[PDB]
Amino acid sequence: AENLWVTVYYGVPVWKDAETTLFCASDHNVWATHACVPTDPNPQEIHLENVTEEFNMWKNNMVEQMHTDIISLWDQSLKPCVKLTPLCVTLQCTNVTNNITDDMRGELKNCSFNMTTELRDKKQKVYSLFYRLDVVQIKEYRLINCNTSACTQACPKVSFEPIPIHYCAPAGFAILKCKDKKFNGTGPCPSVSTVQCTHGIKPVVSTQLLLNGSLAEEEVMIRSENITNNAKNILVQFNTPVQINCTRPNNNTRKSIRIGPGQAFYATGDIIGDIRQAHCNVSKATWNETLGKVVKQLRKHFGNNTIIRFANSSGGDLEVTTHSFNCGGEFFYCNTSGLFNSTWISSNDSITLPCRIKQIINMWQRIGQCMYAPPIQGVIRCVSNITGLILTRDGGSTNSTTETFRPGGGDMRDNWRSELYKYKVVKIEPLGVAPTRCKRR
Amino acid sequence: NPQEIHLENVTEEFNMWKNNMVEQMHTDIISLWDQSLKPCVKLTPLCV
Amino acid sequence: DIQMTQSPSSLSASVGDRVTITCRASQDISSFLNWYQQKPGKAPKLLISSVNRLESGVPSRFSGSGSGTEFTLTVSSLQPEDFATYSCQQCGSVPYTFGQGTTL
Amino acid sequence: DIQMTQSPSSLSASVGDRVTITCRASQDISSFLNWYQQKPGKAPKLLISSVNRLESGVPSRFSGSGSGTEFTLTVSSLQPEDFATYSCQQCGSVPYTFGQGTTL
Amino acid sequence: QVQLQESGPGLVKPSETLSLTCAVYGSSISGGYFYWHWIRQAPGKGLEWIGDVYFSGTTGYNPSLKRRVRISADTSKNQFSLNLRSVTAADTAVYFCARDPRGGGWVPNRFDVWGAGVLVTV
Amino acid sequence: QVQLQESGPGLVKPSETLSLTCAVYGSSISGGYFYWHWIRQAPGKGLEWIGDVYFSGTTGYNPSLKRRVRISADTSKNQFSLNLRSVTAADTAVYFCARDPRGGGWVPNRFDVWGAGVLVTV
Amino acid sequence: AVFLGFLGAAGSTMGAASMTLTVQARNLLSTVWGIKQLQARVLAVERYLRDQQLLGIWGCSGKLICCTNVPWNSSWSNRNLSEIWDNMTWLQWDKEISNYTQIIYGLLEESQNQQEKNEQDLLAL
Amino acid sequence: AVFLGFLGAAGSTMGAASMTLTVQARNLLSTVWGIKQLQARVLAVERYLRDQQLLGIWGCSGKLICCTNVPWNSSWSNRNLSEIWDNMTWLQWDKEISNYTQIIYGLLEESQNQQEKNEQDLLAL
Amino acid sequence: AVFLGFLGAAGSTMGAASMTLTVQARNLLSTVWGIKQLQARVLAVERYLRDQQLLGIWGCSGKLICCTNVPWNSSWSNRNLSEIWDNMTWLQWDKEISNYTQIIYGLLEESQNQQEKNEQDLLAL
Ligand SMILES: *[C@@H]1O[C@H](CO)[C@@H](O[C@@H]2O[C@H](CO)[C@@H](O[C@@H]3O[C@H](CO)[C@@H](O)[C@H](O[C@H]4O[C@H](CO)[C@@H](O)[C@H](O)[C@@H]4O)[C@@H]3O)[C@H](O)[C@H]2NC(C)=O)[C@H](O)[C@H]1NC(C)=O
Ligand SMILES: *[C@@H]1O[C@H](CO)[C@@H](O[C@@H]2O[C@H](CO)[C@@H](O)[C@H](O)[C@H]2NC(C)=O)[C@H](O)[C@H]1NC(C)=O
Ligand SMILES: *[C@@H]1O[C@H](CO)[C@@H](O[C@@H]2O[C@H](CO)[C@@H](O)[C@H](O)[C@H]2NC(C)=O)[C@H](O)[C@H]1NC(C)=O
Ligand SMILES: *[C@@H]1O[C@H](CO)[C@@H](O)[C@H](O)[C@H]1NC(C)=O
Ligand SMILES: *[C@@H]1O[C@H](CO)[C@@H](O)[C@H](O)[C@H]1NC(C)=O
Ligand SMILES: *[C@@H]1O[C@H](CO)[C@@H](O)[C@H](O)[C@H]1NC(C)=O
Ligand SMILES: *[C@@H]1O[C@H](CO)[C@@H](O)[C@H](O)[C@H]1NC(C)=O
Ligand SMILES: *[C@@H]1O[C@H](CO)[C@@H](O)[C@H](O)[C@H]1NC(C)=O
Ligand SMILES: *[C@@H]1O[C@H](CO)[C@@H](O)[C@H](O)[C@H]1NC(C)=O
Ligand SMILES: *[C@@H]1O[C@H](CO)[C@@H](O)[C@H](O)[C@H]1NC(C)=O
Ligand SMILES: *[C@@H]1O[C@H](CO)[C@@H](O)[C@H](O)[C@H]1NC(C)=O
Ligand SMILES: *[C@@H]1O[C@H](CO)[C@@H](O)[C@H](O)[C@H]1NC(C)=O
Ligand SMILES: *[C@@H]1O[C@H](CO)[C@@H](O)[C@H](O)[C@H]1NC(C)=O
Ligand SMILES: *[C@@H]1O[C@H](CO)[C@@H](O)[C@H](O)[C@H]1NC(C)=O
Ligand SMILES: *[C@@H]1O[C@H](CO)[C@@H](O)[C@H](O)[C@H]1NC(C)=O
Ligand SMILES: *[C@@H]1O[C@H](CO)[C@@H](O)[C@H](O)[C@H]1NC(C)=O
Ligand SMILES: *[C@@H]1O[C@H](CO)[C@@H](O)[C@H](O)[C@H]1NC(C)=O
Ligand SMILES: *[C@@H]1O[C@H](CO)[C@@H](O)[C@H](O)[C@H]1NC(C)=O
Ligand SMILES: *[C@@H]1O[C@H](CO)[C@@H](O)[C@H](O)[C@H]1NC(C)=O
Ligand SMILES: *[C@@H]1O[C@H](CO)[C@@H](O)[C@H](O)[C@H]1NC(C)=O
């Protein structure tokens, strides 16, 4: 009676969630563009209609692959550079005394030591100004890296500035993008498109502040895997950027001293001018209005009458306890306590934060690999945007109306999850079987 | 037994100065020499 | 369903006068048009077919012209029996729709 | 080429009053009718589809009824912004012809 | 956010080809879900369908203007164009470009999003 | 430089197989642009055809000798062979092997280059 | 220029989506980072070749819409033609018979084998 | 070997060269240095598979000479048959018809899809 | 669950083993260690594609049992059908005609080319 027969369809529009290996579409630097595919000048976007797809921000395989790829790129770029094993000698250090300011006291020390030279059977006495965080007492000091592992001095030519890296899928795979505004990263997105490649994702590294991130088009947005549970972090994406400018006013000098045949070590010379602490300014009014938006959006979830307390970082290592970022060839560790110090209940001045500059950089929370950064000649200024935040709720006795959110971080996946929250990877299955009145022969 | 197929009544525009094969061979030779020099002693102590 | 419009919708003229009635079709009916001369009381009687093609059995006074989407029927000299209703016809595609009818 | 006629061709009413507009098609279009709305200046905006199915994003006051060769759009309570020119559509056969347009 | 914008000469000598390009920001013409129509409305008259074009080029024009019109859609830059030849005084109208969710058998011809509407006097 | 060389028994006992191997240095047999003919000339007579062999094995022999002849061609070694069986006393002739641009139909059959010319006698 | 509308008909009904199968078929084929790209390409090639072999085993080689001669058992789906080709989309249909796929493939395979054997037997006579 | 007589008919006319398509057709397939030969093999495989996929989309799968049913627009070339097959070579023909190749490819694709739909609805009855 | 009896009919006669070709046909496709694994995959893909190209050149594309019109010369083998399909196995048959394989492939290739040319000539009318 049915007289229905199987029919095979090829090229069917059906897909399933899957994980694969994406590659570059970038258009000398640490983020190697040569080992990255070039993109087309006319990217194609196909906006699917009457389809709703279940997105999940916290189960995306794109962010883990991006983290692994960034680590691999960092290691590959650091491999062809001088290894500073001879520079683990004992240092005779004294405090600086010329043009020293009160803030920059108990700080960069004039150290002198013997080091090898081009000729093996000879030594040279050299001097350099080493920041306090780099050196540690055994009137003699040793670098902090000495008992952990040797450093690979980052080569001067390669620049650390982020460069966008457009991710793409291989053949037979598609990148779905959720255009639905006010999308919280999880659940059914009704507005779906297919993109040949992702947008320009700048591989910026930072903690407590997502610098140069993607801005929300609607308002401040709060995202969390489980907002009820305080263990999981909370990502806040702003709708407008807060302009922030950091600077190291000291006019440092770089001197190259030969530690071996070909290998040359770059050292700090004379601090031309006055020794002043590196400082970073952020607008007070812009910060106030942005914080107002954040507290409103957080009250949307945590109640319309609860008190919102923002306090400085709890504690731990320097990298996670302070806003640590990199720009202009220098790594700053600015202390964010004046920003996240306020309580909320139902003109031209700006907040100035102090910044400490390290050289021995143990990034990626890895042990056994350090990244002594050569000094940068001249004064460094760095203007950037703040468009994100990573906040953690202090659980425990917060069952009452009290709510205390503090800056967090440590893991760099949250930085990548704020820009890949809309991209998902699917695999197509062209084969399909249906009923039809056909009959072969 | 290499095979050579002679083509008749075909005129082809050659340009020795735009041959990618010569640059490919140059890179191949440089890479081969660099690879061949890898498993050999390094004369760092000689700098005396 | 091509729509035919006859202009003027209704006119009054004196005997022995040249008159002209134009017919406009929404689409292009090419050369397929027939005019009809329905006398009050009596059934329609064919006068002109296929643009002009004056069919045998009528005086040579009547004439037809035009093409495409515009056609026209001209009576050279009005006669006492030429006081009937002129009508169009779209004889080029099913269904065949006539005009509104112009009464003299 | 189905022809649509809207009755009345133009009406005036007062705020907070019922109003009804009828649409008649020469042929039988089953239930393939969509009621549109064109505020002066800007482009038409769809109000109702498939006679009765109300498109998401309109006030519930609008309603549609009928079948066969007769359909009707009813506004239960007139509102100040409901002073646009409603139209009809033939969404069941090529070509699609709209109505003349009734101005409120 | 999906909309359409029309461009072209707003005034033309009434004997030549008339070109009007409608470009859509939002959905894509390449996707086989929407037909792209070219509804027209003369002053003091109702709407009047002209033609439509699909992503595969299977276009269909109004029988009244099956000879004087041609619709061409280019998906590389995601737009379409109406070329109306032998324009006359009857073409003084507002030329809207509309989107039809006929692609997919969910609903019949259901013009939902309309362009701004350019009045091409002639 | 294109040339052909013939080898084989220059003198044989009548009434058995006669093998002539023509090898070409130059244009390749495997190329479909050429045919390889086995023209013959007896003393005091004119040129006479025997047969031709193509790269794909579509050979054609003279109607007179359609039974007593067999032409083969090996492309790996790039040479062809003629086997004339039961040769009589009237088979004393100069056996040329010639090229023909029949393939690549620009021109009709046209023997342009010829072999040196062996002097088989029987 | 080849991408130019990939998928697109995902939200369309099965019947309408079956009219744009070509656009979804052209895009199914096209130190350690070179290995990454190479492995991605080889995986895509292997998947495409497996799909092509599966299509060919059923006798549908070189056809986008090829319908076989095996019957549609009612247990797989009781939905009728009027409600499957005009009311349901391809994703929902795939999710509905996701667990009744292997047996259909086996039936198609054995039916094609039997058809080829019958053709050989008939042509031998 | 498979390289025997490769190309060869490049200088031959189109008609003569069309008789030796097999020779060219069968020659299209066959630590850092490993990634060179391996990548080259993968590239050749990908190119051959893409070309085969295009042929299958056009409905000429498994055929060397398979002539379709789409009309030849005179705009592409006004030359008559006698002046192309017996007077022009393949290289010159390719250099001539290069701007209209993609349009012809699209026409072939849409024609094959329409033919498949026509056969489907014919077999439905 | 795709292995499922690989080479199961190895000891079977040719006639019996010819009924299970699909079982053996579906298994042909599926830092330095990754290189070796990927190279093995690429080698398998290349072998399968060369196999498919060889099958297609003979006109047997998309067919597991495809029988052509080339006559069987008695020089290759003198055994009759009764002593082949009912008395011999596939391995013995392969070993018996191992030295008459290339000429058969060539004959099939030219036969298919001639068939295509004749079909084109007939269809031209
Ligand atoms: C967020 O984005 C902003 C804008 O892109 C970004 O500010 C940029 O920072 C980079 C440094 O990270 C600046 O680059 C410098 O630009 C000056 C000119 O203004 C150049 O003279 C500099 O040259 C140095 O570097 C060269 C390459 O190493 C050397 O060859 C040379 O001798 C110099 O040493 C350098 O290129 C860039 O100018 C700004 N752009 C703007 C508009 O301010 C900001 O850094 C980003 N945020 C973060 C956290 O990085
Ligand atoms: C969007 O898709 C939904 C279903 O995915 C469509 O809903 C169908 O609408 C038709 C016509 O109104 C009904 O006959 C069906 O019963 C509905 N099915 C479901 C599951 O709701 C909807 O029509 C589509 N909209 C558009 C504009 O294409
Ligand atoms: C080599 O190719 C040329 C053309 O490229 C051939 O010249 C043709 O000769 C025929 C003779 O019948 C003429 O009808 C053609 O008009 C010629 N071509 C041109 C472009 O004028 C030449 O014959 C070829 N050589 C051989 C040996 O065949
Ligand atoms: C440098 O200053 C710090 C802070 O006053 C002091 O603790 C330290 O002893 C000083 N260094 C020396 C060598 O005295
Ligand atoms: C460097 O070598 C000299 C030579 O003996 C020695 O006096 C001096 O203390 C050394 N420097 C150190 C140990 O920092
Ligand atoms: C290296 O030295 C620092 C400072 O004395 C010390 O805290 C650290 O534990 C040492 N490294 C290890 C692996 O113990
Ligand atoms: C995210 O949104 C989805 C649907 O919009 C909702 O079901 C889910 O509860 C939301 N989760 C959070 C943490 O807001
Ligand atoms: C920072 O935000 C401003 C806001 O308009 C923008 O113009 C500028 O390009 C941004 N800079 C970045 C992302 O580096
Ligand atoms: C979030 O954490 C709370 C902790 O009590 C738990 O009860 C809840 O199930 C979690 N959310 C989900 C979706 O599991
Ligand atoms: C540092 O110490 C050296 C001697 O080791 C001395 O010459 C120099 O003036 C001191 N100050 C600076 C800024 O280098
Ligand atoms: C930061 O603000 C302080 C206080 O007004 C000012 O002295 C300093 O120059 C500012 N620096 C920058 C880079 O804006
Ligand atoms: C530095 O940032 C402040 C806000 O913190 C802003 O008012 C000022 O214009 C900025 N100066 C620059 C970018 O030179
Ligand atoms: C932000 O501005 C409001 C406006 O009066 C003020 O009450 C509040 O204290 C400001 N926030 C600060 C100073 O953190
Ligand atoms: C944070 O602020 C408190 C006072 O509000 C201060 O005692 C503490 O040292 C600051 N830093 C940390 C890491 O808590
Ligand atoms: C930051 O500055 C505040 C105020 O001087 C200080 O109490 C705190 O210890 C500093 N460090 C951190 C991590 O907050
Ligand atoms: C927060 O800022 C105010 C204003 O400068 C300051 O008095 C206070 O000590 C800071 N810390 C806390 C915990 O309030
Ligand atoms: C830093 O000092 C050097 C010393 O000559 C000078 O040339 C340079 O201009 C100084 N930097 C700035 C920003 O002025
Ligand atoms: C499906 O359509 C057939 C057609 O006759 C009908 O008999 C059956 O009742 C329908 N079933 C459903 C569930 O609509
Ligand atoms: C197979 O899938 C259908 C789809 O709804 C479901 O009803 C059925 O229970 C499933 N059977 C098994 C054995 O999983
Ligand atoms: C082919 O070319 C033109 C017509 O296209 C004509 O002059 C010529 O004679 C044609 N060839 C033949 C054989 O008619």
What single letter denotes the amino acid at residue D34? N
Disruptive mutation site among G6, G7, G13, G20 for chain E (greatest number of E CBs within 10 Å): G20
Burial call I56-90: b when 16+ CB within 10 Å, e when fewer: bbbbbbbbbeeeeeeeeeeeeeeeeeeebeeeebb
CA F96 – CA F116 distance, rounded (Å) = 7
Q: CB within 8 A of C103, min separation 6: which ones?
A: C10, C85
Residue F104 near residue F33 (C-beta atoms within 8 A):
yes
Joined together, the tokens standing for residue G9 give 């008909």
Residues in chain G: 125
Contacts of E107 in chain A (CB under 8 A): none
Cis link prior to C95 (omega < 30° from 0)? yes
Is residue A119 less than 8 Å (CB to CB) from chain B?
A: yes
- Sign of the alpha-carbon dihedral angle for A235, A238, A241, A242: negative
Is residue A110 in contact with ligand 10, taking CB distance under 6 Å?
yes
Which residue(s) pair with A266 in the sheet?
A256
Which residue(s) pair with A324 in the sheet?
A333
CA C82 – CA D1 distance, rounded (Å) = 34
Nearest-5° angle of CA C60, CA C65, CA C66? 170
CA A382 – CA E19 distance, rounded (Å) = 51
Q: How far is CA C65 from CA C69, C70, C75, C96, in A?
A: 12, 9, 12, 20
Joined together, the tokens standing for residue A107 give 């700080």
E strand map for A131-185: 135-137, 140-143, 173-178
Residue H60 near residue H68 (C-beta atoms within 8 A):
yes
CA distance A374 to chain G (A): 27
Joined together, the tokens standing for residue A258 give 């030969």
Contacts of A13 in chain E (CB under 8 A): none
Burial call A58-87: b when 16+ CB within 10 Å, e when fewer: eebebbebbbebbeebbeebbeebbebeeb
Q: CB within 8 A of A370, min separation 6: which ones?
A: A145, A148, A149, A150, A151, A152, A360, A361, A362
Residue G87: phi, psi to the nearest 5? -135, -10
For ligand 13, atom 4, name the residue with the nearest CA.
A288
Does H48 reside within a domain? yes
What single letter denotes the amino acid at residue H36? K
For ligand 8, atom 8, name the residue with the nearest CA.
A385
- Tally the C-alpha atoms within 13 A of residue C70's C-alpha that lie toward its C-beta: 3
Q: Which long-range contacts (CB under 8 A, 24 or more apart) does G93-98 make?
A: G93/A432, G93/A434, G93/G14, G94/A12, G94/A14, G94/A429, G94/A432, G97/A433
Yes or no, beta carbons of G50 and I64 under 8 Å apart: no
Residues in chain D: 104
Residue A51 near residue A192 (C-beta atoms within 8 A):
yes
The structure tokens 């640490």 sit at A30
Please return the burial class of E36, using the count of CB atoms within 10 Å of its CB with bins 0-12, 13-18 and 19+. Answer: buried
Joined together, the tokens standing for residue I6 give 């690989």
Distance A393 CA to ligand 9 centre (A): 15
Disruptive mutation site among G47, G53, G101 for chain I (greatest number of I CBs within 10 Å): G53
Which residue stretches of H1-125 are H helix?
14-17, 21-25, 32-57, 82-85, 90-96, 101-124
Which residue(s) pair with E69 in the sheet?
E84
Yes or no, beta carbons of H45 and I50 under 8 Å apart: no
Dihedral in degrees, nearest 10, Cα atoms D65, D70, D75, D78 = 180
SS (H, E, C) chain I: CCCCCCCCCCCCEHHHHHHHHHHHHCCCCCCHHHHHHHHHHHHHHHHHHHHHHHHHHCCCCCCCCCCCCCCCCCCCCCCCCHHHHCCCEHHHHHHHCCCCCHHHHHHHHHHHHHHHHHHHHHHHC
Yes or no, beta carbons of C26 and D2 under 8 Å apart: no
H/E segment holding residue A236: strand A234-248
Joined together, the tokens standing for residue A151 give 């450093």
Yes or no, beta carbons of G45 and H42 under 8 Å apart: yes
Nearest-5° angle of CA I44, CA G65, CA H106? 85
* Pick from G1, G4, G13: CB nearest E106: G13
Burial call H19-49: b when 16+ CB within 10 Å, e when fewer: bbebbbebeebeeeeebeebbebbeebbebb
Does G95 reside within a domain? yes
CA H36 – CA H32 distance, rounded (Å) = 7
Joined together, the tokens standing for residue A46 give 């196909």
The structure tokens 């050569």 sit at A374
Contacts of A436 in chain H (CB under 8 A): 120, 124
DSSP F89: G
Residue G15 near residue A415 (C-beta atoms within 8 A):
no
Residue of chain D nearest E111, judged by CA positions: D46
Joined together, the tokens standing for residue A182 give 């006010």
Yes or no, beta carbons of B5 and F28 under 8 Å apart: yes
Residue A2 near residue G72 (C-beta atoms within 8 A):
yes
DSSP H33: H
Instruction: Give the strand order in the sheet containing G65-71.
Output: A432-436, A5-9, G65-71
Chains A, H: CB contacts within 8 A come to: 7
Residue of chain H nearest F56, judged by CA positions: H20
Distance G74 CA to ligand 19 centre (A): 14
Beta strand D70-75 with C19-25 is unpaired
Q: Which ligand is nearest to the CA of A269?
A: 10
Give the 3-state secondary structure of residue A21: coil
Is residue G22 in contact with ligand 18, taking CB distance under 6 Å?
no
- The secondary structure of A326-382 as a DSSP string is EETTEEEEE--SSSS-EEE-----EEEEEEPEESS--GGG-SS-B--PPP-SS-EEE
Contacts of E67 in chain C (CB under 8 A): 28
Is residue I97 less than 8 Å (CB to CB) from chain G?
A: no
CA H88 – CA H84 distance, rounded (Å) = 5
Which residue(s) pair with C75 in the sheet?
C19, C62
DSSP A153: P
Please return the burial class of A357, using the count of CB atoms within 10 Å of its CB with bins 0-12, 13-18 and 19+. Answer: buried
Alpha carbon of residue A172 to chain centroid: 31
For ligand 2, atom 9, name the residue with the nearest CA.
E106
Is residue A399 in contact with ligand 9, taking CB distance under 6 Å?
no
Does I2 reside within a domain? no
Is residue B44 less than 8 Å (CB to CB) from chain A?
A: yes
Joined together, the tokens standing for residue I104 give 């058969």
Is residue A261 less than 8 Å (CB to CB) from chain B?
A: yes
What single letter denotes the amino acid at residue G62? G
Contacts of C27 in chain E (CB under 8 A): 63-64
Alpha carbon of residue C77 to chain centroid: 15
Residue D23 near residue D72 (C-beta atoms within 8 A):
yes
Q: Which long-range contacts (CB under 8 A, 24 or more apart) does F84-88 make?
A: F84/F17, F84/F18, F84/F20, F84/F50, F85/F16, F85/F17, F85/F18, F86/F15, F86/F16, F87/F12, F87/F14, F87/F15, F87/F16, F87/F18, F87/F122, F88/F14, F88/F15, F88/F122
For ligand 11, atom 10, name the residue with the nearest CA.
A281
DSSP C56: S
Beta strand A307-310 with A402-407 is parallel
Joined together, the tokens standing for residue A320 give 């996670």
Q: Which atom of ligand 15 lies closest to the CA of A322?
A: 13
Disruptive mutation site among H23, H85, H92 for chain F (greatest number of F CBs within 10 Å): H23
Joined together, the tokens standing for residue A332 give 């700053």
Residue of chain H nearest F108, judged by CA positions: H86
For ligand 14, atom 3, name the residue with the nearest CA.
A312
CA proximity to A244, closest of A359, A374, A388: A388
CA C12 – CA C83 distance, rounded (Å) = 9
CA H93 – CA A280 distance, rounded (Å) = 68
Residue E40 near residue E94 (C-beta atoms within 8 A):
yes
CA H112 – CA H56 distance, rounded (Å) = 10
Yes or no, beta carbons of B9 and F106 under 8 Å apart: yes
**Other beta carbons less than 10 A from residue I120's beta carbon:** 13
Is residue A103 in contact with ligand 10, taking CB distance under 6 Å?
no
Determined by which method?
cryo-EM
Which residue(s) pair with D102 in the sheet?
D86
H104 torsion bin: left (phi>0), alpha (psi -120 to 50), beta (else): alpha
Taking chain F, what is the end-to-end CA distance rounded to the nearest angstrom? 33
Please return the burial class of E39, using the count of CB atoms within 10 Å of its CB with bins 0-12, 13-18 and 19+. Answer: buried
Which residue(s) pair with A353 in the sheet?
A280
Is residue A80 less than 8 Å (CB to CB) from chain B?
A: no
Is residue A436 in contact with ligand 11, taking CB distance under 6 Å?
no
Residue A62: phi, psi to the nearest 5? -65, -40
H/E segment holding residue E6: strand E3-7
Alpha carbon of residue F108 to chain centroid: 19
Give the 3-state secondary structure of residue H107: helix
Residue A72 near residue G32 (C-beta atoms within 8 A):
yes
CA C60 – CA C54 distance, rounded (Å) = 8
Does G61 reside within a domain? yes
Does H1 reside within a domain? no
The structure tokens 């060869």 sit at H8
Contacts of A46 in chain E (CB under 8 A): 28, 30-31
CA A131 – CA C55 distance, rounded (Å) = 114
CA proximity to E49, closest of A131, D2, C100: D2
Please return the burial class of C18, using the count of CB atoms within 10 Å of its CB with bins 0-12, 13-18 and 19+. Answer: exposed
Q: CB within 8 A of A214, min separation 6: which ones?
A: A199, A237, A387, A418, A419
H/E segment holding residue D11: none
- Tally the C-alpha atoms within 13 A of residue A40's C-alpha that lie toward its C-beta: 13
Yes or no, beta carbons of C27 and E67 under 8 Å apart: no
CA H37 – CA H6 distance, rounded (Å) = 22
Q: How far is CA A383 from CA A204, A208, A282, in A?
A: 14, 17, 10
- The secondary structure of chain G as a DSSP string is --SSSSS-TTSSBHHHHGGGTTTTTGGGT--HHHHHHHHHHHHHHHHHHHHHHHHHHTT-TT-SEEEEEEE--TTT----HHHHSSS-BHHHHHHHTTTSSHHHHHHHHHHHHHHHHHHHHHHH-
Joined together, the tokens standing for residue A21 give 């290996």
CA proximity to H49, closest of G53, A196, A238, G35: G53
Cis link prior to A190 (omega < 30° from 0)? no
Alpha carbon of residue C94 to chain centroid: 19
Ligand 17 pocket, Cβ-based, cut-off 6 angstroms: A 251, 272, 378-379
Yes or no, beta carbons of E30 and A46 under 8 Å apart: yes
Q: Which atom of ligand 2 lies closest to the CA of D50?
A: 12
Residue A203 near residue A378 (C-beta atoms within 8 A):
no
G98 torsion bin: left (phi>0), alpha (psi -120 to 50), beta (else): alpha
Residue A132 near residue A106 (C-beta atoms within 8 A):
yes
DSSP D103: B
CA proximity to A227, closest of A235, A237, A219: A235
Domain range for residue I62? 7-123
Is residue A321 in contact with ligand 14, taking CB distance under 6 Å?
yes
**Other beta carbons less than 10 A from residue D80's beta carbon:** 7
Yes or no, beta carbons of G12 and E32 under 8 Å apart: yes
SS3 content of chain B, % helix, strand, coil (to 5): 45, 0, 55
Does H31 reside within a domain? yes
For ligand 12, atom 11, name the residue with the nearest CA.
A245
Q: Which atom of ligand 20 lies closest to the CA of H80?
A: 5
Beta strand D19-25 with E79-84 is unpaired
- The secondary structure of A185-228 as a DSSP string is SEEEESSEEEESB--------BSSS-BT-PPPSSS-EEEES-SS
CA distance G56 to chain I (A): 5
Is residue G80 in contact with ligand 18, taking CB distance under 6 Å?
yes
Distance A396 CA to ligand 9 centre (A): 15
Does G92 reside within a domain? yes
Residue F53 near residue F36 (C-beta atoms within 8 A):
yes
Q: Specify the number of domains making up chain H.
A: 1
Does I90 reside within a domain? yes
The structure tokens 């004889």 sit at C91
CA C76 – CA A427 distance, rounded (Å) = 80
Alpha carbon of residue A401 to chain centroid: 33
Residue F60 near residue F52 (C-beta atoms within 8 A):
yes
- Sign of the alpha-carbon dihedral angle for A246, A251, A256, A259: negative
CA A214 – CA A202 distance, rounded (Å) = 10
Joined together, the tokens standing for residue A157 give 């030519």
CA A118 – CA A261 distance, rounded (Å) = 5
Residue G116 near residue G68 (C-beta atoms within 8 A):
no
Q: How far is CA G19 from CA A336, B16, E55, F31, in A?
A: 59, 51, 11, 46
CA distance H38 to chain I (A): 7
Yes or no, beta carbons of H12 and F75 under 8 Å apart: no
C41 torsion bin: left (phi>0), alpha (psi -120 to 50), beta (else): left
Nearest-5° angle of CA B2, CA B6, CA B8? 175
